[PDB]
Design an enzyme around this catalytic site. Structure first.
Site, mmCIF file in Angstrom:
data_model
loop_
_atom_site.group_PDB
_atom_site.id
_atom_site.type_symbol
_atom_site.label_atom_id
_atom_site.label_comp_id
_atom_site.label_asym_id
_atom_site.label_seq_id
_atom_site.Cartn_x
_atom_site.Cartn_y
_atom_site.Cartn_z
ATOM 1 N N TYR A 196 -12.176 52.766 41.686
ATOM 2 C CA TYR A 196 -11.758 52.693 40.291
ATOM 3 C C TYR A 196 -11.544 51.251 39.858
ATOM 4 O O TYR A 196 -11.987 50.843 38.779
ATOM 5 C CB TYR A 196 -10.487 53.513 40.083
ATOM 6 C CG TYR A 196 -10.738 54.908 39.569
ATOM 7 C CD1 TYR A 196 -12.016 55.322 39.227
ATOM 8 C CD2 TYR A 196 -9.695 55.808 39.415
ATOM 9 C CE1 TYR A 196 -12.247 56.595 38.752
ATOM 10 C CE2 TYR A 196 -9.914 57.079 38.940
ATOM 11 C CZ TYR A 196 -11.191 57.469 38.605
ATOM 12 O OH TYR A 196 -11.410 58.739 38.133
ATOM 13 N N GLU A 239 -15.402 44.570 9.872
ATOM 14 C CA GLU A 239 -16.751 44.739 9.342
ATOM 15 C C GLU A 239 -17.529 45.789 10.126
ATOM 16 O O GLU A 239 -18.497 46.360 9.612
ATOM 17 C CB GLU A 239 -17.489 43.402 9.330
ATOM 18 C CG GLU A 239 -17.400 42.687 7.986
ATOM 19 C CD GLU A 239 -18.079 41.335 7.986
ATOM 20 O OE1 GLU A 239 -18.020 40.640 9.020
ATOM 21 O OE2 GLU A 239 -18.675 40.969 6.948
HETATM 22 N N1 LIG Z 1 -13.490 55.471 35.595
HETATM 23 C C1 LIG Z 1 -12.184 55.699 35.679
HETATM 24 N N2 LIG Z 1 -11.668 56.899 35.241
HETATM 25 C C2 LIG Z 1 -10.341 57.137 35.327
HETATM 26 C C3 LIG Z 1 -9.492 56.177 35.856
HETATM 27 N N3 LIG Z 1 -8.238 56.669 35.824
HETATM 28 C C4 LIG Z 1 -8.274 57.907 35.284
HETATM 29 N N4 LIG Z 1 -9.572 58.215 34.978
HETATM 30 C C5 LIG Z 1 -10.050 59.463 34.365
HETATM 31 O O1 LIG Z 1 -8.978 60.113 33.716
HETATM 32 C C6 LIG Z 1 -9.010 61.500 33.980
HETATM 33 C C7 LIG Z 1 -7.595 62.072 33.905
HETATM 34 O O2 LIG Z 1 -6.938 61.392 32.860
HETATM 35 P P1 LIG Z 1 -5.342 61.382 32.637
HETATM 36 O O3 LIG Z 1 -4.911 62.323 31.538
HETATM 37 O O4 LIG Z 1 -4.915 59.967 32.327
HETATM 38 O O5 LIG Z 1 -4.652 61.805 34.021
HETATM 39 P P2 LIG Z 1 -3.047 61.830 34.031
HETATM 40 O O6 LIG Z 1 -2.476 60.593 33.389
HETATM 41 O O7 LIG Z 1 -2.533 62.029 35.434
HETATM 42 O O8 LIG Z 1 -2.685 63.108 33.130
HETATM 43 P P3 LIG Z 1 -3.301 64.549 33.477
HETATM 44 O O9 LIG Z 1 -4.801 64.517 33.302
HETATM 45 O O10 LIG Z 1 -2.700 65.587 32.565
HETATM 46 O O11 LIG Z 1 -2.963 64.860 34.914
HETATM 47 C C8 LIG Z 1 -9.677 61.645 35.336
HETATM 48 O O12 LIG Z 1 -10.503 62.782 35.367
HETATM 49 C C9 LIG Z 1 -10.533 60.401 35.458
HETATM 50 O O13 LIG Z 1 -11.888 60.718 35.254
HETATM 51 C C10 LIG Z 1 -10.003 54.971 36.303
HETATM 52 O O14 LIG Z 1 -9.251 54.123 36.776
HETATM 53 N N5 LIG Z 1 -11.355 54.736 36.214
#
Ligand SMILES: Nc1nc2c(ncn2[C@@H]2O[C@H](COP(=O)(O)OP(=O)(O)OP(=O)(O)O)[C@@H](O)[C@H]2O)c(=O)[nH]1
Ligand SMILES: Nc1ncnc2c1ncn2[C@@H]1O[C@H](COP(=O)(O)OP(=O)(O)NP(=O)(O)O)[C@@H](O)[C@H]1O
Ligand SMILES: Nc1nc2c(ncn2[C@@H]2O[C@H](COP(=O)(O)OP(=O)(O)O)[C@@H](O)[C@H]2O)c(=O)[nH]1
Ligand SMILES: [Mg+2]
Lengths: 330, 422, 421
Positions: free
Chosen positions: B213, B243
């Protein structure tokens, strides 16, 4: 054999006039073709049912059209059931039960009209009868007998060996009734015992599933047991729209999770799955025999004509239309 | 001349880590806050300390600790750090209604403190996940409060969208349907990137079989850096944020640009040969095909030592190579971003020290194809009506799904409609 | 976030003994309560399973309950015997002895309310409850007896909490009495409607794994607990340490459960081998393989609904998802059609001590329909003769209580028939 499915439209309420919501849904009484669409009258969907009901129709009129022809068929020894379900404040509780309580003429609800109307039906035959009633509400996956005096006993629901569709209930005080005065004094306590709270959608919004069944035996000899389930379900509640902050929010979970199970029962029966998951809800097992069994059942849908609540209006109509494909075992 | 930051959900926090690390290193800020020996994304108190104009809010206190308990804990003031007490369980329903409504009020209070601290707010950038719950529910309600108070403000969104094939959670397709009504109606600009194609670059240009990540996030951070931080330095032609809503969005409901940025070589790169890669489909950062659709609008932003005069030939070669089927509505839609400052490599990063860089933004009909990847995934689960009880449990009714599904169809047609006109 | 865990029954109380021993060795907390580890991340989320004590001591947030004193006294006798505070012991004499009716309805009921007080007192001193774990038997009368009633009252008090159950399924292979299957029909009769999620373990699979990969000649009963011990830690692992995708307990429940009834899963610990190769894909192969399924069924007989993967160690999900994506393609018939992604990934940064990589399997497949068919046949066959009913009939259990136990059981089994194919 096919399940009769009718639909009723309510007038605009105060908030519907306070938010300035216009009428987008219209009806045609005799043609039974309800026309519904979005704000701009460009594209419109067509829903065919057994009957349609406009906003100005009365309570006894809907009772006369659908409910009344089913009153006479009870004596043949068959079961009947009808319930309203839909969005909150669509008017289900007023349609089935009625707001304020002899003749089938005034704005009195279906249930006390059924007692007045059926009582002469039995007296016309001069048959030997033992009629009893049952008042219970399903609140947070708990069974509470309104008619019972004590109801402290843990009410469960068991299956039966003989009756496959039916379910045995323990602790239901079946009070005999021979006069209309005796029934009205307890039934008004039942709606006094009915758990209700004030919501911004409806200050008298139901907070529990009130499944009010009616049973009477017939003897004149081929013994017959008449069964009628005047069911009054709770309405779907958009948790943000109604407004609550809490103990009430726990009620919303069980009520909303229960209706969701109901729809899948129709979904499985229409597509003819090998089995249907009635076991996930107590409510589903109550109408398990009613849905796809040996019972002539009916449904009376209510929908708001508000342009704002078009989504719940259109989505609710889905299960109503699909239900016509479901069959029974007369 | 200043704007604030919003990073909602775990995606927002870890992504911003490299973002501010870049921002901190782009201008020679120490990890403490003491510049040894411009102020656009930072306020400066008299103590010789800088503070990031950021908002890091998470419904789970798990991820925030990495920043405030490890390094960079001096750069942040816990004043900005808002934290919840229970995860949304990847439920837009719980994220929007149940928990977020109880935390959202605390967040808004910290915003008006920052907005007043700034003068001439340019806007803010949104960071969250479309697939995750926290980035779906808490974001949506948050966005709605912003447009109520700040109507005439820019709202950029960087929502990492899941892959058509690769996935992390099962209910990912359900959140995207709910967020469509939220972003499209409220947000003016949103950027969708998917780690799948991001993996494709790391194993092709970097030749790396272990991309984590952190590595992908440092890439995304470079995109945001050139979009705003470079536009805070003057060049041959400087560009602004506002813009874009007119130079890149030729109609109200037409705003989902595609971003590409691929000056990725391991430790010879001529000028025009680099600009060609910006239109190569193999490094578009989203699994789509430009040949399947058409190109509506496209603006570039050049970084470092770039001379516009000989650049015009390279732009002409795009027109001279006309096999991309450029649309007819915009003949001369090319706003050229010319920034004199070059990008910088973070020590321990996987990017080489380049002398010039170009990052492309472009709306097209190809992003409509990514919706076709999603729509089927949503419909199948809705048919069997599985996993739906969770969202009904928090109180969001199923009627929302039917209503939101039509917005996906209506939006996807609008992009298809533009190609028909000639 | 706080979580309360409950032990009940002869077997259940023994299983936790190794469990806490592992968790204590995880953070490096000496049995007496003093902390002597070296990692500072261990104290970052100590609140999850412990309460701060005077003199900088730690108390396992545990509730030890049984109907027989001897089994529990042995736990307090051996190692980690002082780690519990004795006030948490709630027990009595005259054990049920594989008598579910006595454990659930008549005898334990007198002791039930006393446990609820300790349960209620524990929750308030905690910041905010997260879930409820109960390790017990399904075929054992006592643990299933009190535990089912214990869950009914608890869930009634806490509708918002998580009812996770690590229980032992009656193995058709080995048992001491032939009366054990009766309890299961009576056990699950209360579970499904009153439990959020359930874990299934079999003894046959227990001895299966220790025999096959571990290549041990004498599998001791305690060493079988060593297998199940870490499996629960995998579910909790996202809560303690910071990770890439920290899937909380409720988050995990929503990913697996396709419908509020079908919530039975099959755990399994992959990276266990003889003294004799250790890669990250090495875990993925063992994950899907049947030799790590703790249920006495072939997972390939049925088909999967959802699969959760929790990995321990420095891993790139690129190396995961690409390796993971093959499983979706390699066995396309093994997954249902209406769910495109059957996988649920969760990458916790810190692995256990000693190992560098690890994998925690969580899967709900239709294969469980077979495990319950084993119980149903024996139950119905012994029910026809009505043999050994007076052992249960006199306690005040009506026949129809068994009647629903039959149909409601097979309905759960019939559910997977449609969802399979
Ligand atoms: N490419 C990338 N994707 C990320 C990264 N961190 C989180 N994600 C994406 O974010 C998704 C989940 O988002 P979040 O809602 O922020 O997860 P959370 O904060 O633990 O909240 P919940 O989803 O409800 O558990 C995952 O399926 C990942 O695909 C990252 O560092 N890099
Ligand atoms: N046809 C109608 N004409 C005028 N008012 C009506 C009509 N039907 C219902 N109402 C009123 O609408 C309100 C809603 O009543 P109610 O029947 O409780 O709604 P509901 O849809 O059943 N929601 P619930 O109370 O939870 O069942 C009441 O004040 C009724 O008097
Ligand atoms: N894994 C494991 N299982 C055990 C252990 N001891 C007993 N069991 C299982 O527990 C089941 C019965 O539990 P039981 O002793 O009746 O619990 P009770 O209800 O309190 O009497 C048996 O089938 C055993 O397989 C143990 O130490 N470890
Ligand atoms: Mg998440």
């Amino acid at each position: 054999q096919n399940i009769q499915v009718y639909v009723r439209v309510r007038p605009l309420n105060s908030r519907e006039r306070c938010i300035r919501s216009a009428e987008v849904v219209d009806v045609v009484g005799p043609r039974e073709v309800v026309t519904r669409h979005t704000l701009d009258s460009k594209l419109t969907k067509k829903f065919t049912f057994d009957r349609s009901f406009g906003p100005e129709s009365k309570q006894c009129d809907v009772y006369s059209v659908v409910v009344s022809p089913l009153i006479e068929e009870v004596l043949n020894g068959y079961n009947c059931t009808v319930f309203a379900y839909g969005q909150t404040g669509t008017g289900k509780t007023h349609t089935m039960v009625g707001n304020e309580t002899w003749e089938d003429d005034s704005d009195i609800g279906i249930i006390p009209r059924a007692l007045s109307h059926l009582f002469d039906e039995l007296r016309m035959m001069e048959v030997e009868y033992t009629m009893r009633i049952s008042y219970l509400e399903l609140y947070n996956e708990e069974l509470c007998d309104l008619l019972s005096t004590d109801d402290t006993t843990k009410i469960r629901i068991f299956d039966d060996s003989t009756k496959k569709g039916s379910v045995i209930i323990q602790g239901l005080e079946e009070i005999p009734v021979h006069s209309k005065d005796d029934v009205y004094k307890l039934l008004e306590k039942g709606k006094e015992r009915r758990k209700t709270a004030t919501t911004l959608m409806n200050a008298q919004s139901s907070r529990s599933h009130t499944v009010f069944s009616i049973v009477v035996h017939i003897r004149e000899d081929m013994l017959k047991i008449g069964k009628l389930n005047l069911v009054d379900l709770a309405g779907s509640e958009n948790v943000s729209k109604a407004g609550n902050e809490g103990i009430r929010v726990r009620e919303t979970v069980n009520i909303n999770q229960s209706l969701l199970t109901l729809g899948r029962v129709i979904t499985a029966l229409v597509d003819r799955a090998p089995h249907v998951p009635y076991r996930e809800s107590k409510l589903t097992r109550l109408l398990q025999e009613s849905l796809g069994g040996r019972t002539k059942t009916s449904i009376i849908a209510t929908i708001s004509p508000g342009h704002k609540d078009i989504e719940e209006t259109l989505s609710t109509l889905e299960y109503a239309h699909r239900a016509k494909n479901i069959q029974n075992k007369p | 001349r200043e704007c604030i930051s919003i990073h909602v959900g775990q995606a927002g926090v870890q992504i911003g880590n490299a973002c501010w690390e870049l921002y901190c290193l782009e201008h020679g800020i120490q990890p403490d806050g003491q510049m040894p020996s411009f102020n656009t994304f930072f306020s400066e108190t008299g103590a010789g300390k800088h503070v990031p104009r950021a908002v890091f809010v998470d419904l789970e206190p798990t991820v925030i600790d990495e920043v405030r308990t490890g390094t960079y804990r001096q750069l942040f003031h816990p004043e900005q750090l808002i934290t919840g007490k229970e995860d949304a369980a990847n439920n837009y329903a719980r994220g929007h209604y149940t928990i977020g409504k109880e935390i959202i009020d605390l967040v808004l209070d910290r915003i008006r403190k920052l907005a007043d601290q700034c003068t001439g707010l340019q806007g803010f950038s949104v960071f969250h996940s479309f697939g995750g719950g926290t980035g779906s529910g808490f974001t949506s309600l948050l966005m709605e409060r912003l447009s109520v108070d700040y109507g005439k403000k820019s709202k950029l969104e960087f929502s990492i969208y899941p892959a058509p094939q690769v996935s992390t959670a099962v209910v990912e397709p359900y959140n995207s349907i709910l967020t469509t009504h939220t972003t499209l109606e409220h947000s003016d600009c949103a950027f969708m990137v998917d780690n799948e194609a991001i993996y494709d670059i790391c194993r092709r240009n970097l030749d790396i079989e272990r991309p984590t990540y952190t590595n992908l996030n440092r890439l995304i951070g470079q995109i945001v850096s050139s979009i705003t931080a470079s536009l805070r330095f003057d060049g041959a032609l400087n560009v602004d944020l506002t813009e874009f809503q007119t130079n890149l969005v030729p109609y109200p409901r037409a705003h989902f640009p595609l971003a590409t940025y691929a000056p990725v070589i391991s430790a010879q790169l001529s000028v025009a040969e680099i600009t060609n890669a910006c239109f190569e489909p193999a490094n578009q950062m989203v699994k789509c095909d430009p040949r399947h659709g058409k190109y509506m609008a496209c603006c570039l932003l050049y970084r470092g030592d770039v001379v516009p005069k000989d650049v015009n030939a390279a732009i002409a070669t795009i027109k001279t190579k006309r096999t991309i089927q450029f649309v007819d509505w915009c003949p001369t839609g090319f706003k050229v971003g010319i920034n004199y400052e070059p990008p910088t490599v973070v020590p321990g990063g996987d990017l080489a020290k380049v002398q010039r860089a170009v990052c492309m933004l472009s709306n097209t009909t190809a992003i409509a194809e990514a919706w076709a990847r999603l729509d089927h995934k949503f419909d199948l689960m809705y048919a069997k009506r599985a996993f739906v009880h969770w969202y009904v449990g928090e109180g969001m009714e199923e009627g929302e799904f039917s209503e939101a599904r039509e917005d996906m169809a209506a939006l996807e047609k609008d992009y298809e409609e533009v190609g028909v006109d000639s | 976030r706080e979580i309360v865990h409950i032990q009940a029954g002869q077997c259940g109380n023994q299983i936790g003994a190794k469990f806490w021993e592992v968790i204590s060795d995880e953070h490096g907390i000496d049995p007496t309560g003093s902390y002597h580890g070296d990692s500072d991340l261990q104290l970052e989320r100590i609140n999850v399973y412990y309460n701060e004590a005077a003199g900088n001591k730690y108390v396992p947030r545990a509730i030890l309950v049984d109907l027989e004193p001897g089994t529990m006294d042995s736990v307090r006798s051996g190692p980690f015997g002082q780690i519990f505070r004795p006030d948490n012991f709630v027990f009595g004499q005259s054990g049920a002895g594989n008598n579910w009716a006595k454990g659930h309805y008549t005898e334990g009921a007198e002791l039930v309310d006393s446990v609820l007080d300790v349960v209620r007192k524990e929750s308030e001193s905690c910041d905010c409850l997260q879930g409820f774990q109960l390790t017990h038997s399904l075929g054992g009368g006592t643990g299933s007896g009190m535990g089912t009633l214990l869950i009914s009252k608890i869930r009634e008090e806490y509708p918002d909490r998580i009812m996770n159950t690590f229980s032992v399924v009656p193995s058709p292979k080995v048992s001491d009495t032939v009366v054990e299957p009766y309890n299961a029909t009576l056990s699950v009769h209360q579970l499904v409607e009153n439990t959020d999620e359930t874990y299934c373990i079999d003894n046959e699979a227990l001895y299966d794994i220790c025999f096959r990969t571990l290549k041990l000649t004498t599998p001791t009963y305690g060493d079988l607990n060593h297998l199940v011990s870490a499996t629960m830690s995998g579910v909790t692992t996202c809560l303690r340490f910071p990770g890439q995708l920290n899937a909380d307990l409720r988050k995990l429940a929503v990913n697996m459960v396709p419908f509020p009834r079908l919530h039975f899963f099959m755990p399994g610990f992959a990276p266990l081998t003889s003294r004799g190769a250790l890669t990250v894909p090495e875990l993925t192969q063992q994950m899907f393989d049947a030799k790590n399924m703790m249920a006495a069924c072939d997972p390939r007989h049925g088909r999967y609904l959802t699969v959760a993967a929790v990995f321990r160690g420095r891993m790139s999900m690129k190396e995961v998802d690409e390796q993971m994506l093959n499983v979706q393609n390699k066995n396309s018939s093994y997954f249902v059609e209406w769910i495109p992604n059957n996988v649920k990934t969760a990458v916790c940064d810190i692995p256990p001590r000693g190992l560098k990589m690890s994998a925690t399997f969580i899967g709900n497949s239709t294969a469980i329909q077979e495990l319950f068919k084993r119980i149903s046949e024996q139950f119905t066959a012994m029910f026809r003769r009505k043999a050994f009913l007076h052992w249960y009939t006199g306690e005040g259990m009506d026949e129809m209580e068994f009647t629903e136990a039959e149909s409601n059981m097979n309905d759960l089994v019939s559910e997977y028939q449609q969802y399979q194919d």
